[PDB]
Design a protein around this ligand. Structure first.
Ligand code: PLP
Ligand code: PLP
Ligand code: PLP
Ligand code: PLP
Ligand code: PLP
Ligand code: PLP
Ligand code: GUA
Ligand code: GUA
Ligand code: GUA
Ligand code: GUA
Ligand code: GUA
Ligand code: GUA
Lengths: 304, 304, 304, 304, 304, 304
């Protein structure tokens, strides 16, 4: 929570940011959202890969044909404006584009407009306060990720998350920190809300998007970072059991950043701590906010 | 719009039924809903298969482990109460149970509670003012229905409607009234928001739930009415091309009631009009609200 | 061979029934056909389930939207005319609707018409001289039947037969009389060019159309004969290994009639000879052309 | 049309190139063919990747075990002879190997030979007059490409085209220029009769053959031209929604050459016009027949 | 454990029943086995559905072409002989047919013989001492059952059990009594070593064998018993979530007999105790050994 | 047969290496094994990729959670010790870890231990005395390889060989030397007990592990040797028909080493003999044991 929320171009106090219970999205999962982090850095408060996230917000909307009135630059300014208007230097930002109060049929009435919200607020490590340093214990879920050509997994939409709820809630109920879902083919897809990476013999592996995995922006950053670090990367389908044979394993996400996975289904991964390659990647990722890692791609948007 | 809406145990005026923009369901499709019709009949206003719908509402929630505080009878009284107060004699009732303002993680905090809304309002034939009489032109969608064990299609959840949007809007954009979706195996599943029935040589056919089709209450009713009429019924998987060979075809649902399908993909069905068996079923169905069809099951819940 | 072939309404000498090499179907498999048998019965030469076959010819053409100018009755009269013109009392008839000389694009030009042929000629036991009496040895093919929603297996089309060729030729190359193909799910579909039945504990079994099996007219007749004989019938998916556990197994088809399968993949079926249930259906079937079996369905169309 | 057609070695007047209506391929889709273009270049009339096409003709026939008596060199010489005999300097050539008048069983009799035809004639832009310059509007089909191990999609066979007909005619019926088919896994396969390419972030993408896509010779040429142009190429599975996120999309084929796709399912691709990368490949491709692009692969076969 | 084990026709003392470590089955899973119970009854010690089990032993062997020298009657006598020779009146019998010391290639040398063992010994309720009366808590496994046409699930072979080990061990590790596996389609298959039954609205449901479920003999007994009890039975595919909506649920097996399942994945089934319909079936099953249930099928083989 | 066998830490004479008939693995396929060859080389007897195999042996056990007491080096010394004692200079070593006499439930009792055996003995070319030189005739099986997430194909377990038996014995019964299996998707997986390689236009191809193929150690070696030879290698999914178009094809394995495949399904590959690239690879492979090929990886473990 924070003091204000950007709501359709106007800064509204948090408590007054409300919508009608008959809003389309509450009944039909009709919304697309983003996860963005603003970090403290040597350059001051910076939003990580800001433009890439707003571009994806638009892409998700385009896929479902949800009309978006704000341009990417407007959404970005709006985002920076809510970060300052709330006096935050570090935070998690949640943009949300949803079909609002427009009538009950699943097909929105012609000419409708979508509602847009953007809330920023501090948010701890997604998988725990000990996650980033100690790693977590994962569980392969009994629920599979959405099949191709059903609900586009390339789009980050609200409705998709019933699946992430089933996969993630199951792991927790069974005492694990996160759940790893397989696609309808029996191959590794990703975690409930984070992409999956494996390390074997010094090479980094990760499932392609066609494994029903969302095109993670953190995932993309890690691949390019790894290439810079001289680490070979292979985007390929991964068997379920490969999780038990990898030297290292970890998850990526805007919220979960880079979280080592010390075990899967009770089976220890490597030494049971953060692996050497994971450490290198992790250090290179954060060194970006210390300036130790050169921002060669222009991934740090300054809030001002 | 109506005048009041049942919101968490109390009837609030329509304009005040609002929830926070950070309500879980707006971001994660975490809601389950129902569709119910109140018919003005020879016995005055009656809710059709009222209890069955509230039970299903409970089952959907149970599947996702969404905590529900109200019992079926409680919900039933609330529904009935909503119709009276708004002074409706015929209407569409939309009960809705969703995870509200509980924080931003997809996994809700332990001990949370859901918000429950029940709105009622008049709503015309779902597929057109001519639909029920002249029948509609349907299109087979290029989008498939959710695969087994990904999202439970036996549950009527809000999140899953992203799929119905893709299926239904496509047919509509191409000039049809509704889209028919195949499951991931290539067999007929159902319409975007209606179950699919076919008639050939006097026998009634419809896919089983395992064809990724919702276990519709209108569908179950039709199967029963058909049997009472001596019409043989076969619940079995159906081929996509079977839509072109069927003597008759129609859709079913609370909103769409019993809508004949006069053409599929531009291929006329039968004589391009409502078929004889669809006719009997339909007359039998609507005969319930005139007394011509004896309510031998107890499907009419008097509003009072 | 025979003397005349009905061609677009005309009785053409067999040697003059030719088409340009640039005819569409020779390049794109764009044709639909039927197999029909005229038997020399107690009622004289009669065409078996004549209307049913011509109706299917139309259905197959309809699925592909091939324009057909002859009505089912026109087709039937032409068929009888062909038989008499060649003075045949028993024969195999091959009606064939195909896209002809209309230009090289796969999509035919608007307003085009199809060419129609009906050739009648004597044709013996499809699966061999001993087949009907002693049964054949079948092999499960390494090639699978077409998947649902690719090339509609419910339509009897020319292009379909590339599959039948692969399945059948393989079995024959390995020394068997016919090949049994499995669908893409690994379940029994049917023989390369005939439906497959199994007999277990006095109950008759056969796969539904959704197992990528063509809705055989002979298959349909068997099912009806079986029920008149007091034999329970079950149309359900069948496992590949069920072929090794069945008491009896046989194939059906217009050309193949009812052929007993004494062995599958070298494993013996029952006594390795025609089974008792098979025997009954067979006698019942052929008894239709001697009068021993009453034509309660009106399956014998008098040629005259 | 043209004056002569090479037929089993002889130069036959177009009007005399006929086959019996009882020819095997007219009933069983038993034929394999090729699309080849002769261009009027700076070197005179040349057949593009002539040997490659005839080799594929043989491969396709080999897969089905169709006996072929002409060698690749005999076929090529016949093709050049056909072109010259019709005094053509630019044309589309259609070689066709088919099972002819050999009896009605699907399995041809032992010792049979195939009939071979090579017809040459002028043929314009496969996808329209503006297609090459302005791009077309594509639609994702509701029909899927043949599954692996059913009908080998690597073989260019006549029977295959029933699928291409369904896919293409649907798009055309809905007002689009071409249809894009997905495989049975829900991933992009290709266009009804052309391979599909995507351009994203300056990188060229196209599905592998295992996505049920025919190994296009034009596709292969593009990949080679791309690498000479310094364009990175990635043959990988592509999601259906990737079509909406790609910077550019285009189709390839002998008939279709290189046709830009400006929109998919009504959604605009990039600027809605030919993309920059597409532009380069296109110029590079056509520059082969003007000399601007060096034939480093020996793709221009002199007709003489 | 007991005093003697029937080993290739000779009663050997338990401890001396050994085989060479190079026995085929230890390296290739090449064995087929059965589970049979002998009960105390009013008729004295009786083996339940004795002939049916030995017939299946033979069927399993036939499927893998393992030569079996003993006839069914010999195996039965041998079985009764080990029950008496060990002085048991109630017990679990384990027949085992395995490829022995014949060399290391997976394909056994031509002319080989299989080894056969039959051990009887008391064995408590498979799923616990409180299982049959209180019911158990089940868990849907993250491991799926074998796909059709890979390893025939209709055959009860040793090699198959690696799967039952993965499914069952997982449920236990997570604190459950048994695991329920879904097939590769996402539908209910069965428990790790027991068939699955569901009860909804007084009707009994169970997956067909094509759901990759073994043709349980206990399962078969229950179906016939239910029919006798007037209970409608439907053999059909069941969705994963149906487990959460059934009134009752239970497992069947020779070892587990009839075990109520009070919960699945933490979700209570019905009232959480043995359900009414399950009780009826259970009582009817055991009444067979008290003589209260008439043995109308001849399921009780007397040991003597 | 040899003279001694390493059995649980001590070398016992061949005739005494026996386990109880009630050993878990005999009834449940619960064992994991390896295949290793000892070559007499320019450096005397050397075990090929000794450590890699013992590691894999450990990984397979870890996948099934089979407790292993010995370390890799321990196992390695035991292997080496087995070769010396038996006085072999070249041989096939079969390590075997299995669940022994621990009770009759599929789930072993907590705290159990596995039995470990390591046998060595001379073994000729796996597919014939002419195999490696003349190549073999292969057949595509009608049985498919285990699907992902059913049985982990990344583990070399005994139970899974029921599948290799079905695949391999079929080809053998039809007169071929080995069978090639497709996965459940219809793509090439591998041979019954060998990985499958294809050569086309100088490039080496082989399916990835995700094609249900074991991650062979000979396969990995070949990929490395090929690269050292400048041969491009592509690990990708391969179509079934690609077997007929490849210039060269061969199998790989510890037992089969590098066996050329001269024909598939009766269709000759290349010139019907070992192909040029297979030749180079092979010469490179066997060159390791003469010193001609520099062991640049450390694949030869001296027996001493
Ligand atoms: C948001 C999300 C991720 C992480 O992607 P980032 O762009 O790196 O935040 C991963 N998986 C799913 C399903 C997601 O919704
Ligand atoms: C609500 C719904 C139906 C219709 O079910 P009824 O219970 O008859 O209203 C059909 N299909 C889907 C996908 C639905 O959501
Ligand atoms: C024609 C055909 C049959 C047989 O059907 P009938 O109507 O009985 O002749 C069976 N299978 C296939 C694939 C066929 O084409
Ligand atoms: C012929 C064909 C193509 C195009 O291949 P080219 O060799 O480039 O002509 C593409 N797809 C299909 C289905 C085809 O038959
Ligand atoms: C043995 C077994 C059963 C139970 O079958 P019964 O004949 O009733 O003993 C169920 N599932 C599997 C996988 C089995 O092996
Ligand atoms: C053992 C085996 C191989 C060969 O692997 P290598 O490590 O090279 O010996 C190939 N396929 C299967 C199924 C195997 O079991
Ligand atoms: O990582 C993110 O930014 C979004 C996923 C986390 C969640 O909202 O559950
Ligand atoms: O709101 C919709 O679009 C679906 C309504 C479904 C029903 O209640 O029948
Ligand atoms: O022509 C064939 O090869 C099969 C025809 C099938 C039939 O007519 O029954
Ligand atoms: O004939 C067609 O319709 C397509 C031919 C494809 C080609 O030759 O490129
Ligand atoms: O029920 C049976 O008879 C066999 C399965 C139990 C087991 O051996 O694990
Ligand atoms: O024993 C077999 O039949 C397989 C041997 C596999 C290998 O070690 O290469």
């Amino acid at each position: 929570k924070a003091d204000y929320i950007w709501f359709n171009g106007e800064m509204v106090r948090w408590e007054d940011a409300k919508v009608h219970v008959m809003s389309h999205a509450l009944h039909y999962g009709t919304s697309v959202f983003e996860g963005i982090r603003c970090y403290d850095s040597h350059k001051g408060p910076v939003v990580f890969r800001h433009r890439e996230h707003m571009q994806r917000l638009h892409d998700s909307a385009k896929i479902y044909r949800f009309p978006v009135s704000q341009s990417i630059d407007e959404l970005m300014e709006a985002c920076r404006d809510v970060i300052r208007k709330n006096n935050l230097t570090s935070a998690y930002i949640r943009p949300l584009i949803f079909v609002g109060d427009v009538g009950m049929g699943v097909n929105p009435p012609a000419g409708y407009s979508t509602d847009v919200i953007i809330a920023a607020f501090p948010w701890g490590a997604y998988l725990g306060a000990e996650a980033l340093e100690q790693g977590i214990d994962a569980m392969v879920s009994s629920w599979n990720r959405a099949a191709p050509n059903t609900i586009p997994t390339a789009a980050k939409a609200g409705g998709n998350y019933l699946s992430s709820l089933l996969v993630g809630s199951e792991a927790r109920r069974h005492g694990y920190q996160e759940g790893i879902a397989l696609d309808v083919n029996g191959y590794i897809s990703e975690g409930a809300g984070e992409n999956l990476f494996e390390v074997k013999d010094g090479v980094l592996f990760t499932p392609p998007f066609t494994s029903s995995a969302l095109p993670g922006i953190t995932r993309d950053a890690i691949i390019k970072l790894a290439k810079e670090l001289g680490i070979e990367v292979r985007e390929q389908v991964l068997s379920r059991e490969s999780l038990y044979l990898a030297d290292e394993v970890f998850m990526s996400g805007t919220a979960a950043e880079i979280t080592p996975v010390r075990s899967v289904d009770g089976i220890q991964v490597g030494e049971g701590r953060c692996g050497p390659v994971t450490k290198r990647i992790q250090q290179a990722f954060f060194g970006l906010f210390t300036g130790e890692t050169e921002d060669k791609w222009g991934w740090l948007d300054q809030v001002n």
